[PDB]
Amino acid sequence: RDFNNLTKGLCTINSWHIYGKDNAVRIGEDSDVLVTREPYVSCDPDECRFYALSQGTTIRGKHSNGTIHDRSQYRALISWPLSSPPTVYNSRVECIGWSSTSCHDGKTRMSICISGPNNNASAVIWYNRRPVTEINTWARNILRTQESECVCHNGVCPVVFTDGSATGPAETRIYYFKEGKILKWEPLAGTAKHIEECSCYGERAEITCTCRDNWQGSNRPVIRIDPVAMTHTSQYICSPVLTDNPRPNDPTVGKCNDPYPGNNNNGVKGFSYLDGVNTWLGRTISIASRSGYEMLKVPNALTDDKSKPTQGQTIVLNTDWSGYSGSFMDYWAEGECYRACFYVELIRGRPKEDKVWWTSNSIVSMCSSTEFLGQWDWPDGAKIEYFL
Amino acid sequence: RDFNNLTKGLCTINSWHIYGKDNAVRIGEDSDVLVTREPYVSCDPDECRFYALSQGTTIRGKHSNGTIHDRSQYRALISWPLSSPPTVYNSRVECIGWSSTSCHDGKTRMSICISGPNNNASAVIWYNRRPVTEINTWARNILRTQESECVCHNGVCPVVFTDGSATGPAETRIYYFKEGKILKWEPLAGTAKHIEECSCYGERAEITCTCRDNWQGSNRPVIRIDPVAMTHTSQYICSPVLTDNPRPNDPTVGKCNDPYPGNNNNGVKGFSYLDGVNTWLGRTISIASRSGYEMLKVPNALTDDKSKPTQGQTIVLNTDWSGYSGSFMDYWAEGECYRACFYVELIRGRPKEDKVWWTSNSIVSMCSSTEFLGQWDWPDGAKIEYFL
Amino acid sequence: RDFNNLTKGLCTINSWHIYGKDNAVRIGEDSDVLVTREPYVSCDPDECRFYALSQGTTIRGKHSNGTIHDRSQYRALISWPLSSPPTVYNSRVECIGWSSTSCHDGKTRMSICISGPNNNASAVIWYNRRPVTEINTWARNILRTQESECVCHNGVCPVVFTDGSATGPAETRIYYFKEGKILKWEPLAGTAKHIEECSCYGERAEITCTCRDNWQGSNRPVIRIDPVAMTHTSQYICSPVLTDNPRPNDPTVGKCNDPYPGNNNNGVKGFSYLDGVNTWLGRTISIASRSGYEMLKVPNALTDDKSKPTQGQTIVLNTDWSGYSGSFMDYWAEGECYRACFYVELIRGRPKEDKVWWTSNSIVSMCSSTEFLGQWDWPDGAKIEYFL
Amino acid sequence: RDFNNLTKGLCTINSWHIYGKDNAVRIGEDSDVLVTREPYVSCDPDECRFYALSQGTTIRGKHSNGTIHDRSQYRALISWPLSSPPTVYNSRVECIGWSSTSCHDGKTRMSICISGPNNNASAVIWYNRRPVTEINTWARNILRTQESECVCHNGVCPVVFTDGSATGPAETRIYYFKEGKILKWEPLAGTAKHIEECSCYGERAEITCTCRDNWQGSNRPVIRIDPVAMTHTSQYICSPVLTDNPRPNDPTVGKCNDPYPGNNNNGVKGFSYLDGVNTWLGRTISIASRSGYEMLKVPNALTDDKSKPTQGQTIVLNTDWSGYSGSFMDYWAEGECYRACFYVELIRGRPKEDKVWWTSNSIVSMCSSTEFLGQWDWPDGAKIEYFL
Ligand SMILES: *[C@@H]1O[C@H](CO)[C@@H](O[C@@H]2O[C@H](CO)[C@@H](O[C@@H]3O[C@H](CO[C@H]4O[C@H](CO)[C@@H](O)[C@H](O)[C@@H]4O)[C@@H](O)[C@H](O[C@H]4O[C@H](CO)[C@@H](O)[C@H](O)[C@@H]4O[C@H]4O[C@H](CO)[C@@H](O)[C@H](O)[C@@H]4O[C@H]4O[C@H](CO)[C@@H](O)[C@H](O)[C@@H]4O)[C@@H]3O)[C@H](O)[C@H]2NC(C)=O)[C@H](O)[C@H]1NC(C)=O
Ligand SMILES: *[C@@H]1O[C@H](CO)[C@@H](O[C@@H]2O[C@H](CO)[C@@H](O[C@@H]3O[C@H](CO[C@H]4O[C@H](CO)[C@@H](O)[C@H](O)[C@@H]4O)[C@@H](O)[C@H](O[C@H]4O[C@H](CO)[C@@H](O)[C@H](O)[C@@H]4O[C@H]4O[C@H](CO)[C@@H](O)[C@H](O)[C@@H]4O[C@H]4O[C@H](CO)[C@@H](O)[C@H](O)[C@@H]4O)[C@@H]3O)[C@H](O)[C@H]2NC(C)=O)[C@H](O)[C@H]1NC(C)=O
Ligand SMILES: *[C@@H]1O[C@H](CO)[C@@H](O[C@@H]2O[C@H](CO)[C@@H](O[C@@H]3O[C@H](CO[C@H]4O[C@H](CO)[C@@H](O)[C@H](O)[C@@H]4O)[C@@H](O)[C@H](O[C@H]4O[C@H](CO)[C@@H](O)[C@H](O)[C@@H]4O[C@H]4O[C@H](CO)[C@@H](O)[C@H](O)[C@@H]4O[C@H]4O[C@H](CO)[C@@H](O)[C@H](O)[C@@H]4O)[C@@H]3O)[C@H](O)[C@H]2NC(C)=O)[C@H](O)[C@H]1NC(C)=O
Ligand SMILES: *[C@@H]1O[C@H](CO)[C@@H](O[C@@H]2O[C@H](CO)[C@@H](O[C@@H]3O[C@H](CO[C@H]4O[C@H](CO)[C@@H](O)[C@H](O)[C@@H]4O)[C@@H](O)[C@H](O[C@H]4O[C@H](CO)[C@@H](O)[C@H](O)[C@@H]4O[C@H]4O[C@H](CO)[C@@H](O)[C@H](O)[C@@H]4O[C@H]4O[C@H](CO)[C@@H](O)[C@H](O)[C@@H]4O)[C@@H]3O)[C@H](O)[C@H]2NC(C)=O)[C@H](O)[C@H]1NC(C)=O
Ligand SMILES: *[C@@H]1O[C@H](CO)[C@@H](O[C@@H]2O[C@H](CO)[C@@H](O)[C@H](O)[C@H]2NC(C)=O)[C@H](O)[C@H]1NC(C)=O
Ligand SMILES: *[C@@H]1O[C@H](CO)[C@@H](O[C@@H]2O[C@H](CO)[C@@H](O)[C@H](O)[C@H]2NC(C)=O)[C@H](O)[C@H]1NC(C)=O
Ligand SMILES: CCC(CC)[C@H](NC(C)=O)[C@@H]1[C@H](O)[C@@H](C(=O)O)C[C@H]1NC(=N)N
Ligand SMILES: CCC(CC)[C@H](NC(C)=O)[C@@H]1[C@H](O)[C@@H](C(=O)O)C[C@H]1NC(=N)N
Ligand SMILES: CCC(CC)[C@H](NC(C)=O)[C@@H]1[C@H](O)[C@@H](C(=O)O)C[C@H]1NC(=N)N
Ligand SMILES: CCC(CC)[C@H](NC(C)=O)[C@@H]1[C@H](O)[C@@H](C(=O)O)C[C@H]1NC(=N)N
Ligand SMILES: [Ca+2]
Ligand SMILES: [Ca+2]
Ligand SMILES: [Ca+2]
């Protein structure tokens, strides 16, 4: 095998079609399904799988109580076959930790898991299913990473990490790995003022990441990385179609180089595909909570500060719970272009549904179509009342 | 690998022998078996598997309530090892949707799943386990397909779809796929007046499909496809041995080019092997409900409007529930001929057994023998009372 | 791969060492373990597995009630990894039926399953996991076979079947298969008067089978097959150490060419290794019931009508339940000789333990050692009281 | 494949990073997890797995009652995927017995299991998943072995066994196996006075084992083996940092060639990495019970009788239960040195937690880092109260 190179551009996105859905919470009501959160999807050259951070207990197990908590010693990055649920018996552990990222470079997979107490966390970088490199916390305040797949080009796989306050200036670093080893790292540059949980994709030798400004911005920061030069830039999506959550109502003009104000110290992982007129943004429908999900076609959203939608697609109704969302692509598919894909985490349980003592999620995932396909909505589908 | 070509004829069918049986409802009474319906069987060059549309819940799970419903967002095409039951832990999801078909072309497998609301459904065509092509609804009324395997010849795999009313004229199309891409499509032609759920098989470079005329006919429509010319014809099985359900009692003369009247707006997926004197038809024993199943040897059933049985075999007693049935063959077996095979869906639960709130099924499947073998009956075997 | 040839002799048996044990009934008390009976062991060139006839229900399932019954439509030959229990999720179905045999010829495996009502049963012969040949009942009275592995030599795999009364003269046939096809068959010849459930092994191009004379004999019939000439002989083990069950007490002189009288119309599957002074016989310890199990070294047991034990080994104490036993060997191991192996079925439930409504078993299996190893006893280990 | 040779030295150990953790007791509260004890980790050239002695029952099963017992007929050596829990459905049985060791030589794996009553136990040596050699008890008093991986060099895999009293002089033998056959064996020599459960690792063609002197010593015996000459030496870790348990408080001077007194007839399996200044010792934090676990850097611990710690790392808090610990390395990783790894058995249930009737454990495992990483503590995490 040779290292994969990002030689293709994105396919034209005219609509989104269903790709995978695991119905984990429904199925888990009466089967040994692990409690998870922070899911994502990632492809190898011969298979695509679902990934997530387990909580080290099943949903019906008594240890599900307290799983709203983010960072215990019982978490791990797990992967499992596309559209099956994450069960005790089919889930493969990639590494131990409570924050992760993973990607295949064309030869083998790199997986990164961070563990430890808030003031002394460390990242372990695995390559070919073996630990290769370790990185200690640099700001002693919850060293953390993407929560979705990284992207590689000619063996170089850039990864974005953050260490420091989630509600003020922090120390974000872009690491450039090759075979699990560090080639280089650099501090965040550009005009993004705070970075969290970047969702990335690659096309024509450039990696684009859409992140979460948890401090002040309701517009999303964007990091663009050149994996050959091992350099990057940062800015915000200029469009007035605001895509973080919670957020204020949409204005008529957005901000390109500063956080769009109105909501502080909160946010949600999200993503976008920024490709001129072929630009689509995801967002929750609600401006106040992680409810609903929609895709909006917003031509030149990255650079046009008055850009508005020209087409859309509802993914999850506003009467259903959503959550994190992120990008991935099958870089090893046939054809001349890369088909944009995304997943949405459908969070169930606490804190929105507090009649149960757990927090878990199911996954729904779509990929783009060049047809203009009809839309449906894709809820988690479980009845909370059954778990009481 | 090379594309498979339909170079052989059917073996002489002198009786049927047991091929597979999963006892899913019995086993599922105390194990994590998924609720399914619309099952089928399909072979790859190195393995044969059971397929079905999951309902995204186990049978003992509380989400089994309401699984008589046909088209939710929680359904998916799943496959699992021959004769094992469809469990949470052994079921592989092929695609998401509530109507499907799947077939191997000798190189890799094509799987098709349709999802969406009644007025805006779409088909996603997967090839080599990746989405390749998408087709939007053309009549905005439950775009739908076979519910059993398709058949390929030199890489061309024809598939029959229907969109429109189930109880009047509809728009049926025959699509010719190759590597998941559309080579051509054509509207139904011939004298069949309504087509649903075709069950197909191939021999000597011709594909024969036996379908369900849900509108007016109790005789079954037959579509014969030339996968090289990419053309087809349609008619009805001429025989007076009527094989849909419900249906009127058998007459002495059938109809070749029009629906045999007596029952409207209802039916059941079924199949036949139409090979001159080597012709065998399946049907429910009851004329009123999906109960029992038998195979009848009816020489020249396709073209002789007075043809009657010359031999038979009971598969399921009339005191046991049956359901959908369809054809498949192992195109990669050894020998000089293709051995005809079929499955019968054994439906349990609603609406016939309404003491339970679910609907599921188990599978029984047979293949032909050149011997004249003794017969047995093969019920689902589960006791409904145990689920109360 | 080439067909395996029986070129080696048996290793010297000086004691028996533990080979596998699944603890199925213990584990199945709280996990999804299938109810089985009539187990055996069989090796492929790269793996050895446990086999048995499932009853199509778990042990804790409500459908376990009534599993003392021998021949339902819900049975199947299943195989699973050595020493794991037969679970819903790890059990591979080989074929459907209530009587079986299976063996690997060095290239691929042949598996045979018989199904049907008592007066109309049929055998389906599978080869390379596909049905190849079918055989109809010839005496219309429970067509049946070995219940343990067959043995192959240069692709020829002889199999012993019986059809007819279990308590009087019956029609026993020896079939010679090659690639699942019938080369030849012949009626039983020699002085054995009734044959059931032969347990076979091969060495130096000769296959030896030890069977169950269910009609009159408490000594076991022996069939010796030449798989090149496709011919056989039959007689009884001459020794006065009687090895069927139930049986009368041991006399001082046995019978070579007639059934040793005392007990009629009953028996148990068993085995022996008949190799001059390297001869070892298995048997239940009790003369009245399937309780205990021991191995006895009885030099020249086949031909010496006064031969008595010169060494022994207890396998299962007389205060523990045993059941069927049979021979198998790993024909693909390293070294210059074939190591004799056997299994013992540890039956639990009915009819001996009727506080439960089911009948199942676990497996224990040993192979010979050239050392004189210490002995232990190997009970099933489950507590019936826990299942109440 | 070629036999692996121990050509590299140990990497510099500056801290320990998380490697694997299965959370088995937490997960097993509501899933079919086997009861185990005496776990370890061992790598093949393409995968690393967890190993343990099953008790042949799940933790929630009624047969979990009485699993404090060490040596039943229902135990077996099982292996399962790294960091998954040992479940009924994912656990592979390697051999049957109640004492084991296992290692890969670069070509295939050797696994050894001992079974039998106290006065008549025997070892069966498996190679390439087949039984090859058997060894009978030589002192008729619980023949027993390492309970952690063995190490191979150019196909020679030395294994340490003990037979005889656990509380006085016993007969310890070092066996040198190659392809499962005995090349040679020799009685223990040197100044170690009693040996149990050696934990071994290899580097630069030398194998170092740290053992448990159950009779008189609270310092640990050390056996150093030359696998080419097939010779060994023995002594004790000289350091005053005592690492068995229970043990007296640390003195200022230890003993090099005799047991450090204070505690008799008790101990716990443990390990060390003895590499000059790159020396790290593991031990329980408590001197009285199997509680807590810490790693201490003790330069020249093997040869310096006043050596004290210069650095440390807490693995398990003293308020959490620990248990056995042992060494393993991935001998097939990339790079120029071997990365030291270890596991800690986290024992739950009896005898410390007697509100439950079972005894089981979970596993935590770490490997060394050349960074100075922050530390966390890694408890089992299960709540005993949930099992009541
Ligand atoms: C069969 O399926 C097909 C295919 O899916 C169906 O056709 C689809 O129908 C969709 C629904 O109508 C449609 O999606 C909409 O597209 C609009 C763009 O098109 C229109 O404008 C362009 C540009 O002028 C024209 O060319 C075009 O012809 C249309 O006129 C979007 O504008 C739509 O999104 C907005 O509305 C929805 C509510 O429906 C909001 O959720 C969404 O966020 C957008 O509105 C908010 O945002 C904008 C931008 O800032 C504001 O201006 C606006 O006030 C809203 O703001 C409030 O709400 C947000 C969200 O809560 C909040 O943050 C903010 O603060 C404010 O409170 C929508 O995306 C598909 O494009 C169309 N597809 C095709 C190919 O046709 C067909 O209907 C189906 N058939 C049947 C029978 O069902
Ligand atoms: C051991 O096993 C062997 C092998 O299986 C057993 O032998 C099998 O025995 C079967 C049962 O007898 C037999 O199957 C029958 O075959 C008949 C054909 O053979 C006869 O006719 C030919 C032609 O003349 C002769 O050559 C031949 O020798 C025989 O005489 C079929 O006609 C049979 O089917 C009809 O009967 C069954 C009821 O038994 C119906 O369910 C079935 O649908 C058929 O009847 C309906 O349909 C016809 C056609 O329209 C009507 O004319 C008729 O009135 C019936 O219609 C009513 O019912 C239907 C269904 O509900 C409804 O739709 C309609 O409106 C009406 O209400 C049957 O198939 C096997 O061929 C035979 N095999 C061999 C190789 O011998 C042996 O018995 C076993 N041994 C033991 C001891 O058990
Ligand atoms: C550590 O482990 C080692 C290795 O396992 C242990 O050593 C083993 O010890 C075993 C038990 O003593 C021993 O097995 C016995 O071997 C006898 C043969 O050896 C003796 O005879 C020869 C020939 O003369 C001598 O060379 C030799 O030195 C000995 O003297 C067998 O004869 C034994 O079997 C008979 O006894 C058992 C009861 O113990 C019966 O269950 C068994 O069926 C045999 O007896 C019945 O059958 C014979 C034959 O017809 C009759 O003559 C007799 O009356 C019995 O019949 C009744 O019972 C049967 C069964 O219910 C019934 O059908 C019938 O109708 C009647 O009612 C036995 O096999 C191993 O050989 C020996 N191994 C070695 C290598 O030494 C050591 O003890 C262990 N250490 C500790 C400390 O435990
Ligand atoms: C972020 O993470 C980093 C990295 O992990 C954290 O930094 C680590 O901090 C650890 C805790 O302080 C530290 O570990 C200690 O290291 C000591 C060695 O360093 C000191 O001495 C050297 C040599 O002079 C200096 O160079 C160095 O600068 C330091 O001064 C060890 O000595 C420590 O172990 C002893 O203490 C612990 C209690 O903390 C005991 O459990 C342990 O067993 C040791 O003490 C017993 O044993 C000795 C030896 O016999 C006795 O002398 C002593 O009295 C104790 O004996 C009693 O207890 C034992 C055990 O119960 C019993 O058997 C006996 O009988 C007696 O009852 C300890 O290992 C790491 O090295 C350090 N790492 C780095 C790289 O810095 C940082 O803190 C984290 N940050 C935050 C904010 O949390
Ligand atoms: C991605 O591009 C790199 C860089 O050009 C390709 O790398 C070359 O691969 C060939 C084939 O193995 C080698 O002969 C060269 O030595 C490689 N290195 C360089 C720098 O040229 C790589 O093959 C490309 N990937 C694919 C899938 O084509
Ligand atoms: C078992 O013996 C048969 C018969 O001698 C061997 O068969 C020959 O195999 C070789 C190798 O494939 C062929 O060239 C011959 O044509 C085969 N047939 C005969 C009749 O000679 C077979 O190889 C032996 N099996 C093994 C494992 O050696
Ligand atoms: C404290 C910093 C937060 C990110 C901005 C926090 N990240 C981590 C590693 O803890 C996330 C946030 O608290 C949770 C959420 O917003 O859903 C998930 C939670 N993420 C994870 N548990 N992996
Ligand atoms: C409305 C059109 C019907 C076919 C003629 C209908 N098909 C679909 C896709 O919904 C089927 C029919 O209602 C059910 C049955 O007859 O058993 C199954 C049902 N089929 C599926 N759920 N896949
Ligand atoms: C009626 C003839 C019997 C053999 C001599 C009978 N065989 C079959 C195929 O039914 C066996 C016997 O009744 C049972 C037993 O003795 O344990 C098992 C039972 N065997 C099986 N259920 N496979
Ligand atoms: C009697 C000798 C003991 C070792 C010094 C004893 N070993 C065996 C094979 O029984 C161990 C000891 O009793 C137990 C413990 O200390 O945890 C485990 C127990 N080990 C095992 N059950 N495998
Ligand atoms: Ca924000
Ligand atoms: Ca109809
Ligand atoms: Ca359960």
Ligand SMILES: [Ca+2]
């Ligand atoms: Ca008898």
Ligand SMILES: [Ca+2]
């Ligand atoms: Ca000690």
